[PDB]
């Protein structure tokens, strides 16, 4: 039932400060430690610290003891055994190689040799410390394409191009359609920009009737895009059924 | 807006005599604060009516006659709260407003006013839970 939700992505100048959030829900906040772990560029995982919402007792790894600042809010009781809460982490003087996925994680037990142990991890919060500016997603629509035309199936989607930094969160039909959706990854080009593609596999029958719209967003560059996918294809690949 | 005297007035007793003070003065309004160079501000006196034959709790309980205390009397209480009730109907949406009036019908609100921070529970001392302890000649190998 428990649930830890972290803040959105941020792009920071090297040498700058930043504060990451972690809003908890579904369980008693002060009953469990909140940890902080990051996935470094070439150093894999990396536990940074933990903190008690109850006692305020901290434990920071020697590496960050004078770099990051663990803090917490007071719990708001929801039920007899559930409460909302918020936890933070301010890693100042951001050096490079700090770019990675930052995690908060609640403890395991309440009494024992493994109380603080990271059990319920959050979403992650991708940090990108860099000089490079921010750039939005140039959203275009992808025309219909029948893969297995003998049966009649097909696929449509949206192409995200020329943007930085990651990530991009795509959705279909105002955040309702889930069946057949598939968001591919992306690569660092020569320039430095990123670019993904999101496909929702649906046939060429319900083209002129049902609506399909890609709901693309980019928190670092702060953009929210809605695009109508055109039901048309002047090519010999799909034009067989009609 | 109406009711028994005790409800349309401020009621209480000092040294035993039961009072019914006109709270009209306390509710004229005077909401906009200018202070008027700190003038026109001393006491605010309410006319009080006094009665001896008195019946509380309505029907339950008999009527009581309060014998007079000889000589003049005066008591000081501290006002620690109020009991209000809102006039409610459709009115001017913008920029209209709601008006409030005093109520004293049910004494239970006096009791709720003090007890709000309390609740009573029953303790349930019996408890049952799994354990690697069996009975008779065993408590896990010994």
């Amino acid at each position: 039932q428990g649930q830890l939700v972290q803040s959105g992505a941020e792009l920071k100048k090297p040498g700058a400060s930043v504060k990451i959030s972690c809003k908890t829900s579904g369980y008693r906040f002060n009953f469990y430690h909140i940890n902080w772990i990051r996935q470094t560029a070439g150093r894999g995982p990396e536990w940074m610290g933990w903190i008690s919402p109850y006692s305020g007792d901290k434990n920071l790894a020697p590496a960050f003891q004078d770099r990051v600042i663990m803090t917490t809010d007071t719990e708001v009781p929801v039920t007899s055994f559930t409460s909302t809460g918020a936890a933070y982490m301010e890693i100042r003087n951001l050096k490079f190689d700090d770019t990675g996925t930052y995690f908060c994680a609640k403890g395991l037990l309440r009494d024992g040799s493994s109380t603080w142990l990271p059990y319920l991890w959050g979403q992650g919060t991708l940090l990108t410390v860099s000089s490079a500016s921010t750039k939005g997603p140039s959203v275009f629509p992808l025309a219909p394409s029948s893969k297995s035309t003998s049966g009649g199936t097909a696929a449509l989607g949206c192409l995200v191009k020329d943007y930085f930094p990651e990530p991009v969160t795509v959705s279909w039909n105002s955040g309702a359609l889930t069946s057949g959706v598939h968001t591919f990854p992306a690569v660092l080009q020569s320039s430095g920009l990123y670019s993904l593609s999101s496909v929702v596999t649906v046939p060429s029958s319900s083209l002129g009737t049902q609506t399909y719209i890609c709901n693309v967003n980019h928190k670092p560059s702060n953009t929210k895009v809605d695009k109508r996918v055109e039901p048309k294809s002047c090519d010999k690949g799909l034009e067989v059924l009609f | 807006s109406g009711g028994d005297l005790e409800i349309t007035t401020h009621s209480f007793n000092c040294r035993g005599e039961f009072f019914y003070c006109n709270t009209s003065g306390l509710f004229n309004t005077s909401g906009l604060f200018n202070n008027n160079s700190n003038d026109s501000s001393g006491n605010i006196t309410l006319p009080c009516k006094i009665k001896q034959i008195v019946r509380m709790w309505q029907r339950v309980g008999q009527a009581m006659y309060a014998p007079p205390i000889a000589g003049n009397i005066t008591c000081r209480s501290r006002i620690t709260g109020l009991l209000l009730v809102r006039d409610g109907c459709k009115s001017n949406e913008t920029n209209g407003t709601e008006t409030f009036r005093p109520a004293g019908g049910d004494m239970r609100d006096n009791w709720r006013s003090e007890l709000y921070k309390y609740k009573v529970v029953k303790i349930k001392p019996l408890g049952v839970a799994p354990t690697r302890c069996r009975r008779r000649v065993v408590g896990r190998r010994r």
Binding site: - | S1, G2, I7, Q58, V85, R86, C89, K90, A103, D106
Partner: protein, 119 residues
Amino acid sequence: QVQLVQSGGQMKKPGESMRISCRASGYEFIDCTLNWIRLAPGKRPEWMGWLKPRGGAVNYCRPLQGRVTMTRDVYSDTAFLELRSLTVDDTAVYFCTRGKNCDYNWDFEHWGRGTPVIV
């Protein structure tokens, strides 16, 4: 079951007054709150004010503030309402109404039989 028997509907003229009673039974007259909801041609059922028969505590609807006067004889268990400065528009059938329970006034399961006043 409870029931609220009512008065006969009198015939009146504008610029006058009216008084219509309502006797209750089957429940402790004091413990529960009674309302007065009249119904005119075509308009939404108009609530005029509730009456708590403990100490005659009342709460009148804004347009009726001045004309309406809800009282009660706690001894004869009768609910009274006076309405002065009459109009042909305030003409309606009148219904004394108490809720489902004493914990909530607004679920009017119990209505009295309509009293028809003519102006």
